[PDB]
Symmetry: C5
């Protein structure tokens, strides 16, 4: 298996690493039908989403999508620095594939 | 693919944005049958609920409804200020569709 | 829907409101068979339970039962003041139907 | 229903109350196959387990076992003092049936 | 059952105990398809994973794998010192079977 977020990110097409090195600026969560999602933004001006579960997802990602939203919320509430995000850039806003935190 | 809570909220009928910019004053939770819900209030006097899950909800909303109630509880306990709420105004108290928070 | 704990409590028979206005003194949790329950006590001497899930509950209460024990646990740990409890008084100790907290 | 951990522990044979009055010294968690369990220790030298889910447990205990592991972890991390444990003494290490915390 | 992580770790082949005695330096989480995993690193240069769920896992490990990832996230966020890690050394990064922490 991969040893870092960049190596893992490099296995997927349509992705890029954003080096954030900052805590989350805003956290938005929706339970509106067909828009069950989370959106985060940074002072840098970037906006990112955890996509609504769909047909591009495989069954093993169900729990992982929910785990990623949980992580973003607690990270926001604890003011924890995000290091990097591995995102899919074929979506707007860019879609989170993975996150890393350090220190 | 909305990038803000206002863009998201505008995709639905019977919704309006409330700019709360304040922490939750009170948190109420019920496990009584047919009233499995959460009620929150603010010092402005405005009251909101997360609705009891029902026929108006699609199955993709089930985990999202549970997530929203989780978020309100930790938000209340941490004194986290809420920025905006997107709420369905055809229910009393108005019903939360989305929440945002910024730091 | 109800807008307050007292209005919601009043929809049910054999219930009453206890205005606690205090933090939980003690928290007990059991995973023993047929005693899968939580008991809270207050400095006042009053004791309440979240009952073991049984034939009196409906399917929609299953997750709400688990949420109320989740809430009491984090309320205890954070030493958060409870405002009111809506309880059924046809059980001993009285059984929790709803809780409210205010800051 | 029982009103205290000692009353509830008394409803079962092969149990005893250990009075702890202390925070957990060590927390151990395993996801190894057939050893999915948690072991806690105290500076007294006393050691307890949450057993691996199995044939000795009825269905209503499955979510309660997972809740006990969650309470041990958050209690460990917050340094919360444990009051009492009700344990089965026909297991080594003794097996947790219930826990209480006070103040 | 086992009373310590070393006992437990010794029941399996292809394992070893790493004495960490340190907080987690970095936490990485991926919801990317086929890489639904967590990776952690230490200032020692060691890197460990919670493997993606696969054919090597039995059903009882499903919830425990999700629990271990929950534990690594809250351990990271709180800067809780890990004592030991029991890992399978037939995977890269080495794969976590159990963790211990002491206060
Ligand atoms: O590139 C992919 N896989 C590469 C891979 C597979 C196996 C091993 C290693 C690498 C891959 C596979 C399935 C879907 C996929 O990507 C798609 O779905 C994603 C969510 O899962 C995002 O929504 C992306 O925007 C969408 O393009 C990307
Ligand atoms: O307006 C809606 N959808 C627009 C839409 C459709 C598809 C994608 C994005 C937006 C829509 C769809 C189903 C129900 C709905 O609204 C209804 O259900 C809500 C809970 O989900 C609330 O309880 C509202 O009070 C109730 O009026 C509103
Ligand atoms: O009084 C009730 N309902 C009024 C009501 C029904 C539906 C919607 C709103 C209000 C009602 C319905 C079913 C059980 C009930 O009460 C029963 O179950 C409770 C737990 O749910 C407690 O265990 C009470 O001790 C037991 O009497 C009380
Ligand atoms: O004593 C029990 N129930 C109380 C009771 C039973 C029967 C009559 C009266 C009271 C009881 C029931 C089922 C199992 C039980 O105990 C068993 O399983 C426990 C976990 O559930 C532990 O693993 C104990 O070590 C094991 O002996 C103890
Ligand atoms: O050696 C094993 N078990 C010994 C054992 C059995 C019963 C009780 C206690 C110990 C054992 C059993 C099943 C799988 C196993 O190991 C395998 O799966 C692991 C995850 O479960 C890791 O992925 C290891 O890398 C892979 O070899 C190792």
């Amino acid at each position: 298996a991969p040893q870092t977020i960049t190596e893992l990110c490099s296995e997927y097409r349509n992705t890029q690493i954003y080096t954030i090195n900052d805590k989350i600026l805003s956290y938005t969560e929706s339970m509106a039908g067909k828009r069950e999602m989370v959106i985060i933004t940074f002072k840098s001006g970037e906006t990112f989403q955890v996509e609504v579960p769909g047909s591009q997802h495989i069954d093993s990602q169900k729990k992982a999508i929910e785990r990623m939203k949980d992580t973003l919320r607690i990270t926001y509430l604890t003011e924890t620095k995000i290091d990097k995000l591995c995102v899919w850039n074929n979506k707007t806003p860019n879609s989170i594939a993975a996150i890393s935190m350090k220190n």
